Structure 1
Amino acid sequence: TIPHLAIDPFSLDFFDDPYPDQQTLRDAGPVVYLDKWNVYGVARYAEVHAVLNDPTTFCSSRGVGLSDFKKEKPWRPPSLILEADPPAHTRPRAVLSKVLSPATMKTIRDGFAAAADAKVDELLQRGCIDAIADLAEAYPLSVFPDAMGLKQEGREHLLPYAGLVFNAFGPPNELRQTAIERSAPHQAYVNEQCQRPNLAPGGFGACIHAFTDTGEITPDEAPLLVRSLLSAGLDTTVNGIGAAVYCLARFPGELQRLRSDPTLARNAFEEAVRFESPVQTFFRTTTREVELGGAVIGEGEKVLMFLGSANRDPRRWSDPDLYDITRKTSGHVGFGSGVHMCVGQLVARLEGEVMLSALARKVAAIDIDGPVKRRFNNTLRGLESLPVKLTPA
């Protein structure tokens, strides 16, 4: 009843161009079985959304990667938020929600915007730049580590650590095995910066530790919650901003519309999150026998959700393969959906908005003028290098 497919969604050929294989996954049926990894797969919007919004049946406490924490040891102590289910998930989630709250965005927006304008000004002086290293990476590195309260020393471990985290969600292929092999120095750095004395006053890290006296989290929970932000808070925005710039570079008509109305910057970034879906996939584990799209999935089964495929499903989206900065993007699953929906989405949207605003006001054209190189990761979709020429407005 359930179709069996041999597609490996974690192969380099798949990363290089996933869209034909994602249509195959969608059109094979609402639920498929991936023989390569012995997991179920859902690639249509409907089933992805349903799984995300039934955390009781499709749990996260057994891991959101391929590995089932009930069968294998996690490569690192489980996240108190990402790899937890209600009710244990609830209070750690509340603390991060308040640490990254709408009121908190008011305290950082001016500095984030100023750093975005300054970066674009700097890049326009050079003209020809790498939109990845020099923009998508450089800008988040210039605001987020400081917003965390990290010292300057050792920040070079942050991106390698994040690449490891997102590779570790994948199956035990070479990408994952090699990442874990090289992980020891990055884990040591990150874990040490999570301790209260190492987080500067007023930053996200110190604010997490400050919540340890309300009864929502205990002092011994704060380090791992800082670890969450150091895991998910940087490389995500790198690939989100990278996606947005890549879209504007490929679709000059949409850059011209953005220039004509810079207030579209926020929706232009949201559309880029849907269009590229930098965070591609996550797993759930069934806690009971469940019926999903006519298939009966047994207990203790892994279910792979194709977020990027759901965001291009023609059953849900009109012209899904078009980048449209005025599209009604509400409902896309690029940030997830439900109780685990990205708790840092306000930070991600703030960074994306202010950067796209700077480009909208300062840049007249974005022209690819060199070889485009893709970066391969078991969970993240994005570029290694994006040579562009920036023409000033």
Structure 2
Amino acid sequence: TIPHLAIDPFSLDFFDDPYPDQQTLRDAGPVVYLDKWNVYGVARYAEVHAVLNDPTTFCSSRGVGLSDFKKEKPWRPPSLILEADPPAHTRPRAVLSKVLSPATMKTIRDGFAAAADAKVDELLQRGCIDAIADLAEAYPLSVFPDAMGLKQEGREHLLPYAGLVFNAFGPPNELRQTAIERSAPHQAYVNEQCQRPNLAPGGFGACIHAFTDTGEITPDEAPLLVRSLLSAGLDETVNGIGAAVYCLARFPGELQRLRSDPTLARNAFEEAVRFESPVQTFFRTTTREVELGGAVIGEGEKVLMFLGSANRDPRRWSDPDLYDITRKTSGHVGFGSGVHMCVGQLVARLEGEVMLSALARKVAAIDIDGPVKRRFNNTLRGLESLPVKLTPA
């Protein structure tokens, strides 16, 4: 009753161009079985949204990667928030929700916006740049570690650790195993910076520790929660900003609309998150035998969700493959949906918005002028290099 497919969603062939295969996964049925990895898969918007919003049936405490924590040991201690279900998930979630709250965004917006303006003016003096290394990567690295309260020493481990985290969600292919095997130096750096004395007072990490006073988390829980913000938020935001620049170069009419109304910057970034879906895939594990679509999934089975596919499903989106900066983007699952929906979404949107605002006000054209290279990762989509020429407005 359930179609079996041999598509490998963790192959380089898939990463290079997943969209034809995503249609095949969508059109094969509401639920598919991926024989290559012995997991179920859902690729349409309806089922992805349904799974995300049914946490008691499709749980996260057995891991949101391929590996099942009931069967295998986690490569690192499980995340206190991402790999927890209610009620264990709730109070750590509340802490990060307050640390990364709307109120918090007021304290960082001016600095984040000023840095984005300055970065774009710096790049305009160069003309031709790499929009990944010199922009999409450079800008978040220039604001987020400082906002986190990290010391200067050791920040060279941040990008390697982020890449490792998202590769480890995947199957035990080469990308995953090569990342985990010699990852101890990255883990030692991260674990050290999660300790209270190493975090600048007033930053995100120190604020997490400050919540131990309230009874929401214990002191021994706090380092693990800080770790979440050195795991998530970097590569996804980098990839999202890079995709936004790519779309503004490939859809030049949309850059001209953004220039004419820079207040579209926030939605222009949201549309890029839907278009790119920097977090392409992750898993749930069934706690019960379940009827999804017309399929009966057994208990203890891994269920792979295709967020990028859900955000390009023509059953839900008009012209899903077009980048449209005035599209009504509410309802996309690029940030997830339900109880786990990205707790850092306000930080990501802030970085994306102010960068696209700086582009909107300062740049007249963005032209690709060199070979474009893709960045390969088991669960992230994004570019490795994006040579562009920036024309000043």
- Equivalent in the alignment of 2:218: 218
CA offset at residue 139 of structure 1? 0.1
Residues 316-371 of structure 1: CA deviation (Å, up to 9, x unaligned): 00100100000000000000000000000000000000000000000000000000
How far apart, CA to CA, are the structure 2 residues paired with 1:122 and 1:254? 23
How far apart, CA to CA, are the structure 2 residues paired with 1:196 and 1:233? 20
Residues 64-123 of structure 1: CA deviation (Å, up to 9, x unaligned): 000000000000000000000000000000000000000000000000000000000000
Residues 241-261 of structure 1: CA deviation (Å, up to 9, x unaligned): 111111111110000000000
Please show how residues 169-318 of structure 1 align to structure 2 within 5 Å.
Answer: 169-318=169-318
How far apart, CA to CA, are the structure 1 residues paired with 2:234 and 2:305? 23
- Equivalent in the alignment of 2:69: 69
Greater Cα offset, 176-185 or 347-356 = 176-185
How far apart, CA to CA, are the structure 2 residues paired with 1:188 and 1:243? 31
Residues 188-222 of structure 1: CA deviation (Å, up to 9, x unaligned): 10000000000001100000000001010000011
How far apart, CA to CA, are the structure 1 residues paired with 2:103 and 2:64? 30
How far apart, CA to CA, are the structure 2 residues paired with 1:31 and 1:236? 27
How far apart, CA to CA, are the structure 2 residues paired with 1:30 and 1:82? 26
Query: 2:220 is paired with a residue of what secondary structure?
Result: helix
Greater Cα offset, 234-243 or 332-341 = 234-243
Query: 1:85 is paired with a residue of what secondary structure?
Result: coil
How far apart, CA to CA, are the structure 2 residues paired with 1:321 and 1:88? 39
- Identical counterparts, % of pairs: 100
CA offset at residue 33 of structure 1? 0.1
How far apart, CA to CA, are the structure 1 residues paired with 2:242 and 2:155? 20
How far apart, CA to CA, are the structure 2 residues paired with 1:206 and 1:237? 22
CA offset at residue 306 of structure 1? 0.1
How far apart, CA to CA, are the structure 1 residues paired with 2:163 and 2:330? 28
Residues 153-201 of structure 1: CA deviation (Å, up to 9, x unaligned): 1100000000000000000000000000231110010000000000001
5+ long unaligned stretches in structure 2: none
How far apart, CA to CA, are the structure 2 residues paired with 1:126 and 1:315? 44
How far apart, CA to CA, are the structure 2 residues paired with 1:273 and 1:388? 20
How far apart, CA to CA, are the structure 1 residues paired with 2:238 and 2:373? 15
Please show how residues 31-46 of structure 1 align to structure 2 within 5 Å.
Answer: 31-46=31-46
How far apart, CA to CA, are the structure 2 residues paired with 1:159 and 1:72? 26
How far apart, CA to CA, are the structure 2 residues paired with 1:114 and 1:244? 19
How far apart, CA to CA, are the structure 2 residues paired with 1:169 and 1:287? 19
Give the aligned length.
393
CA offset at residue 2 of structure 1? 0.2
CA offset at residue 233 of structure 1? 2.1
Greater Cα offset, 113-122 or 180-189 = 180-189
How far apart, CA to CA, are the structure 1 residues paired with 2:236 and 2:257? 26
CA offset at residue 236 of structure 1? 1.5
CA offset at residue 240 of structure 1? 1.2
- Equivalent in the alignment of 2:350: 350
- Aligned CA-pair RMSD: 0.4
Greater Cα offset, 237-246 or 376-385 = 237-246
How far apart, CA to CA, are the structure 1 residues paired with 2:182 and 2:275? 32
Query: 1:383 is paired with a residue of what secondary structure?
Result: strand
How far apart, CA to CA, are the structure 2 residues paired with 1:125 and 1:58? 51
Greater Cα offset, 85-94 or 173-182 = 173-182
Query: 2:81 is paired with a residue of what secondary structure?
Result: coil
Query: 1:340 is paired with a residue of what secondary structure?
Result: coil
How far apart, CA to CA, are the structure 2 residues paired with 1:101 and 1:23? 37
- Equivalent in the alignment of 2:388: 388
Greater Cα offset, 233-242 or 106-115 = 233-242
How far apart, CA to CA, are the structure 2 residues paired with 1:144 and 1:66? 29
CA offset at residue 234 of structure 1? 1.3
CA offset at residue 267 of structure 1? 0.3
CA offset at residue 377 of structure 1? 0.1
- Equivalent in the alignment of 1:56: 56
How far apart, CA to CA, are the structure 1 residues paired with 2:231 and 2:113? 23
How far apart, CA to CA, are the structure 2 residues paired with 1:189 and 1:203? 18
Residues 141-162 of structure 1: CA deviation (Å, up to 9, x unaligned): 0000000000111100000000
When the two structures are superposed, what TM-score results if normalisation uses the length of structure 2? 1.00
CA offset at residue 309 of structure 1? 0.2
- Equivalent in the alignment of 1:8: 8
Residues 3-35 of structure 1: CA deviation (Å, up to 9, x unaligned): 000000000000000000000000000000000
Query: 1:219 is paired with a residue of what secondary structure?
Result: coil
How far apart, CA to CA, are the structure 2 residues paired with 1:115 and 1:185? 30
Extract structure 1 runs of 4+ deviating beyond 3 A: none
